[PDB]
Amino acid sequence: RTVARDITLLECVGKGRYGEVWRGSWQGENVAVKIFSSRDEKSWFRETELYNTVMLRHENILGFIASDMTSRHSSTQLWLITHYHEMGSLYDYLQLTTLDTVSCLRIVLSIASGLAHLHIEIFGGKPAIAHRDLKSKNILVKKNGQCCIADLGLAVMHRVGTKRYMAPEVLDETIQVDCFDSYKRVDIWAFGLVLWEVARRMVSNGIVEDYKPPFYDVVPNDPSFEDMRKVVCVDQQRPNIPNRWFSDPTLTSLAKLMKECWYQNPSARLTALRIKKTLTKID
Ligand SMILES: COc1cc(-c2cncc(-c3ccc(C4CCN(C)CC4)cc3)c2C)cc(OC)c1OC
Numbered sequence: 001r002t003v004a005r006d007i008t009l010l011e012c013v014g015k016g017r018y019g020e021v022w023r024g025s026w027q028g029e030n031v032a033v034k035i036f037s038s039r040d041e042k043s044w045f046r047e048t049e050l051y052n053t054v055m056l057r058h059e060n061i062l063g064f065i066a067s068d069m070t071s072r073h074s075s076t077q078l079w080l081i082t083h084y085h086e087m088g089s090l091y092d093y094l095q096l097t098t099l100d101t102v103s104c105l106r107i108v109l110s111i112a113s114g115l116a117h118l119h120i121e122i123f124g125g126k127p128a129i130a131h132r133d134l135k136s137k138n139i140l141v142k143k144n145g146q147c148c149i150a151d152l153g154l155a156v157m158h159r160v161g162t163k164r165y166m167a168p169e170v171l172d173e174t175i176q177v178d179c180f181d182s183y184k185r186v187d188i189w190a191f192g193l194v195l196w197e198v199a200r201r202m203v204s205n206g207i208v209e210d211y212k213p214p215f216y217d218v219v220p221n222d223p224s225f226e227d228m229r230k231v232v233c234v235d236q237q238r239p240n241i242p243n244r245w246f247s248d249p250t251l252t253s254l255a256k257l258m259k260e261c262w263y264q265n266p267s268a269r270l271t272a273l274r275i276k277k278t279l280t281k282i283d
Pocket residue numbers: 002003004005026065066067068081
């Protein structure tokens with residue numbers, strides 16, 4: 001039988017130190033193709049090892065299609081092939097759109113749903129998985145208004161994370177590295193930051209905040225590890241909650257939820273399952 005493997009690369013939709021992502025075509029259908037830099041080969045290996053262990057299938061996890069290694073004259077080419085989400089990342093989307101109550105809740109509940117699926121161990125199933133680099137650039141927007149979580153190149157099953165989103169125990173190097181729940185609690189911190197990024201773009205009483213990344217007002221672009229440790233650990237700053245949120249019941253509830261993802265004590269933070277329940281009861 002014929003095994004059609006040709007993928008037509010059509011449009012570069014992302015370039016970075018990681019390598020590149022392309023819109024491609026296979027058998028008349030869009031796929032996304034991540035081409036890894038030699039610098040980031042371990043991310044391909046880790047995501048490939050995870051998918052060889054457990055074939056994750058969830059509406060709020062970027063859908064796996066293939067991992068490909070191809071021999072070249074003097075190098076190895078590493079591709080990850082996934083579902084293609086034409087609306088692009090949540091980071092991108094929040095810069096060109098404001099949200100209503102229903103669209104804000106649908107976005108954050110879908111992220112919580114993907115994250116709880118990663119975190120939960122299922123017997124007879126899947127191992128528990130922590131993401132370790134959750135951020136708005138690693139979330140894609142789907143046409144149905146839900147999102148999905150992308151990039152399991154740092155994930156751990158039961159490169160460092162993006163510094164702007166690191167939890168205090170990562171920055172002060174007190175994280176209990178031998179304890180898997182520690183990694184879930186680092187994802188919850190990052191989730192709270194993503195919640196804040198999205199909530200800012202929800203309109204209430206004719207008011208909205210401009211898109212900003214977490215800590216935009218207290219650290220530079222490409223903040224150093226020390227820049228982040230001083231803000232998050234030494235001064236114990238957290239993102240600002242604008243007064244206008246407290247006129248809106250949804251943003252008032254979301255502010256409370258963010259606070260419960262940002263405790264200094266990792267053990268005090270909400271679980272992804274509790275976040276899901278809280279979001280289902282909002283509105
Ligand atoms: C190797 O490489 C790539 C392959 C493909 C691809 C193309 N046609 C058919 C297939 C196929 C799937 C599954 C079976 C099964 C059938 C039932 N039987 C009991 C076991 C075998 C056979 C064939 C594949 C996997 C696509 C690719 O890219 C999208 C590939 O490159 C990454």
